[PDB]
DNA sequence: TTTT
DNA sequence: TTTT
DNA sequence: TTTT
């Protein structure tokens, strides 16, 4: 099984451990094992004119991971959201509400159907290819959401006098000569991890540690030795 | 404490990742500390000739506890079934509309009721040993899971072109040359493991890796060199 | 951030494994990087004489938290109780109400409210500090529940003919020559872990192992 | 409720 | 629903 | 709500 998708994870953060805005949107190609993506297209938000209230990051997720599929045809894609694996084709005013998820899910996938729906629809005309909504229960996604943690740290190296940068749930980074190395903390998950060619800027420090408001969430925090 | 748990667990996948049909149940004496269990039973069922909503699963698991319990003479038995630890022998319509469960699990609990009280009270009666729905919160549950996820492997081992076995959640096995080893990969519960001996058989290549559908949940794959 | 946070947790059990009391409650000053703490302060209950559904835990770790906050002056407190991250000054019937809990946990805080929301706009006015109802999603709260852990070892050591000490959630202790090391096994917390010293009696075994009724808690037992 |  |  |  060949599977591409997408999510969009990693958050500026401010002194006070207060999100301002998110990084990092990338679309993974998985292919057994299931480890790891080897091929990867990533769109990099701007955290600091970002509407976190909201949604702009699935709408970039979907389009990012057709425009990997175009390239190397899947099986299926997979989207960050937990709807049961619902194929977003499928989505109308009908099949949301019979969905298992809060009202307040309901009535915001009704607004996103409007544009979505159409979308899922073509690309499955075109190819045969479901994007489905399966969101938690994907490996898929979650080697998506390790990469969109190694792409923020490797935006923060890029743009930083000091960084706080919010990870994607319990996952760790390693910096090396010239990449980065993201690893899932959860062993349950069966090691999953992703890796980034890089250049390591001079004249900065970093330090990973616990978000202390966030439990089981890392921040990468780097510091200039100016 | 001594405890006799049984469990179900093991699946036939198909190529896409689909279950197919159950493999092993099996059920286990455990004893202090309370990690792993040296005197056990496995009943393997037809995976092919499975009803995955038939729940066959539960009335296996407590004959096959039943029969060992007879053997070892246990404090209780625990059963796979998150219930809030209430004994089977008091499970009738009154008991079970008063549980803390979804009305499905009620309406699937009045049906095994008619053949499961009757075969706990006969068993309490007999012996004073009581038959409790503790389910999750079970340690000797888990390493009678574990223990499932490696006689579900042998049994792949004896019967295998190519085989998926889906495991038990989060716990991984290693193929030792006259043995099978299962450990749970949650070092939150403190290190639960168990061992089978058996004949591994030649001709043939394995591999352990995430199911891609099923996030913290192992494949186990059989493949002949053929 | 500079944070005081506190918790109870550690009990004693029966031959059944059944809990009979809590052990230690623990205030700690946690601050960069939110690994560990050095500076602590603890108070023992009387397992014996406990009431589980007394309620005392939350009365008694606010004003050790308090205690603790005085001292070494923090940005803030966090209380081991998930309702959001409400400040417990805040805390009437009307806000209560607003809060997704569900109708028991209302009614407990109904309760609660009476002593709690007065002593936390004191402190508030006296301080500037709030007390914020974080729990689960704090980790200074972890490092407190871990102390609580360590303590309770501590409490099992300094009276054992023997005992049964139920830890808190998924950790470990281990026992060196002259301090009891306590850490998370749930490595999805960064490598949360405490320390604390103490005379090491002889003549004594120990061992950890599952407690076989609470899959993912630990039990410490010792024997003379 | 259980199951991958 | 998703996000730290 | 919290506790093993």
Known sequence: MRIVAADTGGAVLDESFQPVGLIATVAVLVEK????????????ADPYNYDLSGRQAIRDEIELAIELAR?????????????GGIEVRK?????????????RGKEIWKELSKDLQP?????????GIEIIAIGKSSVP?????????????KWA?????????????????????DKIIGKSLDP???????????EVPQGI?????????????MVFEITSKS
Chains 1, 2 share one sequence.
């Open 91 to 103: 989505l109308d005013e009908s099949t949301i509400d019979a969905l298992q998820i809060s009202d």
């Open 141 to 153: 996604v979650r080697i998506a959401e390790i990469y969109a943690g190694i792409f923020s740290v």
């Open 205 to 217: 420090k970093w330090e990973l540690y616990p978000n202390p408001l966030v439990r089981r969430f």
């Open 157 to 177: 190296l890029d743009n930083v006098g000091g960084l706080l940068v919010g990870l994607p749930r319990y996952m760790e980074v390693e910096i090396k000569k």
């Open 33 to 44: 094992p299931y480890k790891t993506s080897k091929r990867f297209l990533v769109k990099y």
């Open 71 to 83: 390239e190397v045809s899947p099986d299926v894609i997979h989207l960050n959201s937990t709807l």
């Open 119 to 127: 979308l899922a629809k073509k690309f499955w005309e075109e190819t």
């Open 188 to 198: 349950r998950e069966g090691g999953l991890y992703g890796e980034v060619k890089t």
